[PDB]
């Protein structure tokens, strides 16, 4: 009764605040063109399918994680390897790079987050306390980290004490990914209940909830200015949302796309949006006007992870055939 | 000049170590007990690995795709729920070509084999058992599965 009335009121307010679309205002901008990109590097050292990857702050080093139980640190300029770290548990599905560059993190089906130190490689900490498998983890600092788990919760930890500083709760499905804002004051989350949520790190409470998809949400990322975000789902669509307007603006889909979306990322200026799919290749979308402008197709299995440099000079894609490809 | 020499020397040792783990990875067979803990054992100079998942929720549609390269699935048997889960696993996209070792009389076996032989196009089978005998049974079914895979590879089946 009360919940239905509140939902109806929120819907009416949402309809009232909307007067124009993103397509009508961007009907005069010049189109991007045909984006043609080719493979510049090929990194091949893993034995099983790759699950996650993260770039580095200097845009030259990156870390990769695979289901065979290994963490590999690369040098994309010379293709030479740097560090190879074996893991205690073979089922790892996330990895992260510290902004300073002297820490890495990983986690998976063991419901534990492990942090390793590179400037000694020996393990530094083993945070436990979740009830389900970890899906994502992002560093904020040398002593702060945010994680999301399969028990429908997110967490903010303190590495020095090894304890859980804050717990974010309210989702009704497995939380799949998280994305941290440039201001580091808030972040966003998506789960399997077909909804996304905005969390404030300082206070620790949910501020806004967005509901536009029809199935589970797989990937999420922030826009460069921090005033919007995009998310991909299992219904073969992508959607862009807004914070000051609090509603969806644009959707990206095609009539011949059936598979779901696994990864999502943005370009330097926000003009391009990269989406990895389950049909072995990934697409490029124009953010201002929803229109496909390029295809990266070199992998024999499904693309699982996607990243773009901090300088915007190259993109890196991992896959289930155990290869990492750099495109530019 | 010296930095590049050091970098190449560092990469060479990594490659030499990595080439050692591939032989260990291809010589072991993985299993999955579906009634995370890991148990490794050896039978007739053959390495075997088994994992059990019981620390997760009863929503398997997301963490079950991590086990798409396993050799076989050990299903321990309410009958209708087991049949429905068997049908759900049998028709998945990533776990499509996966054999199931049942551990349960002839009526139930026939009902399971009815859904087992409905589809598959001769890519996976079902091995029902009525229960140090279990390990031997699993060993025999694994040998049969790998032999059939090799037969398909060499164009003899």
């Amino acid at each position: 009764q009360e919940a239905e009335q509140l939902k109806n009121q929120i819907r009416d307010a949402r309809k009232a605040c909307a007067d124009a679309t993103l397509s009508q205002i961007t009907n005069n901008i010049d189109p991007v063109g045909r984006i043609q990109m080719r493979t510049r590097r090929t990194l091949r050292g893993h034995l099983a399918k790759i699950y996650a990857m993260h770039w580095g702050t200097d845009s030259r080093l990156l870390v990769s994680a695979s289901q065979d139980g290994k963490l590999i640190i690369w040098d994309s300029y010379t293709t030479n390897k740097v560090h190879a770290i074996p893991l205690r548990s073979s089922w790892v599905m996330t990895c992260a790079y510290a902004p300073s560059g002297n820490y890495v993190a990983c986690g998976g089906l063991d419901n534990i987050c492990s942090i390793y130190n590179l400037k000694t490689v020996r393990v530094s900490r083993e945070l436990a306390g979740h009830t389900g498998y970890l899906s994502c983890c992002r560093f904020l600092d040398d002593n702060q980290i945010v994680t999301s788990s399969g028990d429908t919760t997110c967490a903010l930890w303190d590495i020095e004490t090894g304890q859980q500083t804050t717990t974010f709760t309210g989702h009704t499905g497995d939380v799949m990914s998280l994305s941290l804002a440039p201001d580091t004051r808030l972040f966003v989350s998506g789960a399997c209940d077909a909804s996304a949520k905005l969390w404030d790190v300082r206070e620790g409470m949910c501020r806004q909830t967005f509901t536009g998809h029809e199935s589970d949400i797989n990937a999420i990322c922030f826009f460069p200015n921090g005033n919007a975000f995009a998310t991909g789902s299992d219904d073969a669509t992508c959607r862009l949302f807004d914070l000051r307007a609090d509603q969806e603006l644009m959707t990206y889909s095609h009539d011949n796309i059936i598979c779901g979306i696994t990864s999502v990322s943005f370009s330097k200026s926000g003009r391009l949006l990269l989406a990895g799919y389950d049909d072995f290749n990934c697409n490029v979308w124009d953010a201002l006007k929803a229109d496909r402008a390029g295809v990266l197709a070199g992998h024999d299995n499904r693309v699982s992870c996607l990243g773009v440099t901090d300088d915007g000079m190259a993109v890196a894609t991992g896959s289930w055939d155990s290869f990492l490809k750099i495109w530019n | 000049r010296n930095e590049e020499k050091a970098q190449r020397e560092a990469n060479k040792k990594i490659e030499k170590q990595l080439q050692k783990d591939k032989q260990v990875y291809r010589a072991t067979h993985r299993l999955l007990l579906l009634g995370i803990f890991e148990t490794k054992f050896q039978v007739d100079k053959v390495n075997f690995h088994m994992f059990d998942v019981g620390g997760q929720r009863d929503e398997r549609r997301k963490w079950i795709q991590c086990f798409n390269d396993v050799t076989a699935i050990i299903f321990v048997v309410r009958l209708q729920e087991a049949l429905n889960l068997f049908k759900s696993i049998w028709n998945n996209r990533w776990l499509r070509t996966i054999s199931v070792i049942l551990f349960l009389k002839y009526f139930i076996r026939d009902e399971f084999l009815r859904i087992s032989t409905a589809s598959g196009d001769g890519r996976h089978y079902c091995y029902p058992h009525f229960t140090t005998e279990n390990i031997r049974r699993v060993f025999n079914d694994c040998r049969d599965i790998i032999q059939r895979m090799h037969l398909r590879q060499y164009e003899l089946l």
Partner: nanobody, 122 residues
Framework: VQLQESGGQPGGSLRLSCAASGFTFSNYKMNWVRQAPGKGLEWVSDISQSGASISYTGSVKGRFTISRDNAKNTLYLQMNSLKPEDTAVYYC?????????????????????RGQGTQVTV
């Protein structure tokens, strides 16, 4: 995603309807599940995207009929000669992913794509 269920002496007849909003009804596989008092959730009946393939549990095979209407995005369950052993709360579940032949977690507790249920006592 919203699913609303409505409707509901031994040997009688009854009919339940369920209306769906928020998603494309045509390309999803739908099903009826039941929860009896003293037991857990159970699977009752299934129906495909176009109604070509229909599946029933052995307990109610023959007595009950499940149908679907894509023009009005609603589905129906018709039960005849109901027995007192059929008193339970009926839910309408929806398969999580489109264009798929697998439906994993419809009988799980804390499922997200399931309605509120209607009580039937016979």
């Amino acid at each position: 995603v919203q699913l609303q269920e409505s409707g509901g002496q031994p040997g009688g007849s009854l009919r339940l309807s369920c209306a769906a909003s928020g998603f494309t009804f045509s390309n999803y596989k739908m099903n009826w599940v039941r929860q009896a008092p003293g037991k857990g959730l159970e699977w009752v009946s299934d129906i495909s995207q176009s109604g070509a393939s229909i599946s029933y549990t052995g307990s109610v095979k023959g007595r009950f009929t499940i149908s679907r209407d894509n023009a009005k995005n609603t589905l129906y369950l018709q039960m005849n000669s109901l027995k007192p052993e059929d008193t339970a709360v009926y839910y309408c579940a929806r398969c999580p992913a489109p264009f798929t032949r697998d439906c994993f977690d419809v009988t799980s507790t804390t499922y997200a794509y399931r309605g509120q249920g209607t009580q039937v006592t016979v």
